[PDB]
Amino acid sequence: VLKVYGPHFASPKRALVTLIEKGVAFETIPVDLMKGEHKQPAYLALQPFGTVPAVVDGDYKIFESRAVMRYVAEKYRSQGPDLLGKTVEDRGQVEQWLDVEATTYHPPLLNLTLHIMFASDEKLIKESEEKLAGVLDVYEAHLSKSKYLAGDFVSLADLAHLPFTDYLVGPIGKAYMIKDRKHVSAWWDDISSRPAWKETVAKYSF
């Protein structure tokens, strides 16, 4: 059975929500980051960068949360929603917005997340919020003409935004970044209410 390491943290929930969306059986294994368990040789053999998640599926091992999403969505492509889309063109749009999350949306969000948890670099915080807001403005324009990021179907690209945006509008206290943008807000309301996400949060929150 597929095993996911570090379910209580945010990046692993990208994989968990995908697993739950595809109806794939899995177990989770905690990793004690606060006591540095992830920097010890045992976990480093699973994830050489010492970060979570790592996934072991029998003899097969894979890390990087969005790679795991792609692996699960391709391996179990025929069951559940097709989170990769149907055509090569569809998958292209999915890969596109997934990389937008990885390279453009997530990094400034992570900086706000970390540096507001540090109360810190107040210049970095101001820059990170503005960069993120700039990204959300693009999303806003895009989502006003497209139901989901990759098209008229929900995909890995959308699911990838769930764990850290949830943090953003919750304990970080910046719900206005989502709320003040009408189309983004409706999109967020839609994907964050999907049963797979509700189950992920109910089961694996701090």
Ligand X SMILES: N[C@@H](CCC(=O)N[C@@H](CS(=O)(=O)O)C(=O)NCC(=O)O)C(=O)O
Which positions lie near a second copy, rule CB under 8 A? 48-49, 60, 62-64, 66-67, 70-71, 74-75, 88-89, 91-93, 95-96, 98-100, 102-104, 106-107, 135, 138, 141-142
Q: Is 18 helix (H, G, I), strand (E, B) or coil?
A: helix
Between CA 184 and CA 164 the distance in angstroms is: 15
How does 107-143 read in b/e, with b if 16+ C-beta sit within 10 Å? ebbbbbbebbeeeeeeeebeebbebbeebbeebbebb
Shortest distance, CB of residue 103 to ligand X, whole angstroms?
4
> Mask 89-118, x = binds ligand X (CB under 6 A)?
--------------x---------------
Shortest distance, CB of residue 193 to a second copy, whole angstroms?
26
Shortest distance, CB of residue 197 to a second copy, whole angstroms?
22
**Phi then psi dihedrals of residue 36, to 5 deg:** 75, 20
Q: Known binder of ligand: residue 51? A: yes
Q: Does 87 bind ligand X (CB under 6 A)?
A: no
Q: Known binder of ligand: residue 38? A: yes
Between CA 122 and CA 64 the distance in angstroms is: 29
Site residues (vs ligand X, CB under 6 A): 9-11, 33, 38, 51-53, 64-65, 103
